[PDB]
Structure formats: C-alpha cells, structure tokens
C-alpha cells in the first residue's frame, strides 16, 4: 500500500478570452488513495455550486483534482478550500490569498 497527503493550492484566474470572468480554483495534487472530500468555502460556509471538478492520475498511485468555479470576490469576504483525506486527522483548511 501507499498513502500520500495532498498538496493544496488556492488561487484565482481570469480566462483570457473573457477577462471579466473570475474563477476560484483549488488544485489538490499528488494524493493517494483517491478517496477524498473537497469543498470551497465563503466566510466559512460551503459553496454548494462548483461547476468544474476534474480528476486525473499520473502513476497509478498519484491523483490530481482541479476544483473550480466562477465567483465575484469582495474585500470583505474570505474564501478557502476544505479538504478531508485519510492522511489528514482533521479537515485541512487553506485560505485564499486575495493577491493570488
């Protein structure tokens, strides 16, 4: 068996074809086993609607998740990723830095 803790990155992107659109992204990478729970949060509450969730693997024992959706941030709001995995004894919460 092998188990690997995911790396978690949270960041925002505008598609170059429509620069007015802003997306909040969470790249959850290099994890094993594949079983996992991943949420975006706004001021601590779960965002129910996330339009994209794209899973892949490299080696048979290494998975990658891109989880992202359109959003309209303000300076007041705090956004975060919340990840549960068997390698994590407590849910891991990674805050979005608004400059990223």
Numbering used by the authors: 0 to 99
Please give the exact wording used by the authors of the publication that reports this structure.
A recent case of systemic amyloidosis involves the highly unstable D76N mutation of beta-2 microglobulin (β2m). The D76N mutant is strongly amyloidogenic and, in contrast to the wt protein, aggregates efficiently and abundantly without seeding and under native conditions. Indeed, the 76 position is located in a solvent exposed loop between β-strands E and F. A detailed analysis of the interaction energies of the ensembles reveals that D76 is at the center of a network of stabilizing electrostatic interactions that are lost in the D76N mutant.
Mutation of D76 to N weakens a number of interactions with charged residues. In particular a salt-bridge with K41 is lost and the interaction with the R97 side chain that mediates an interaction between the C- and the N-termini of the protein disappears. The analysis of the ensembles suggests that D76 is in a key position with respect to the electrostatic interactions among surface residues. In order to confirm the role of the long-range interaction between R97 and D76, the R97Q mutant was prepared: in keeping with the above considerations, the mutant protein presents a significantly lower Tm value and intriguingly Q97 side chain is disordered in the structure. A specifically designed R97Q mutant next to the C-terminus allowed us to further test this hypothesis showing that the weakening of the interaction between positions 76 and 97 significantly decreases β2m thermal stability. Finally, to further strengthen the hypothesis about the importance of surface electrostatic interactions centered around D76 in determining the stability of β2m, the nonbonded energy was recalculated from the RAM simulation of the wt by modifying one-by-one the charge state for all the D–N mutants previously reported, as well as for R97Q. The resulting energies were then compared with the corresponding melting temperatures showing a remarkable correlation. Particularly relevant is the agreement between the prediction of the increased stability for the D98N mutant and the effect of the R97 mutation: this shows an energy increase higher than any of the D–N mutations but lower than the N76 mutant in agreement with the hypothesis that the interaction between the EF loop and the C-terminal residues have an important role for the stability of the protein. Thermodynamic stability of the native fold is lowered due to the weakening of a set of electrostatic interactions and to the diminished interaction between the C-terminal residues and the β2m hydrophobic core.
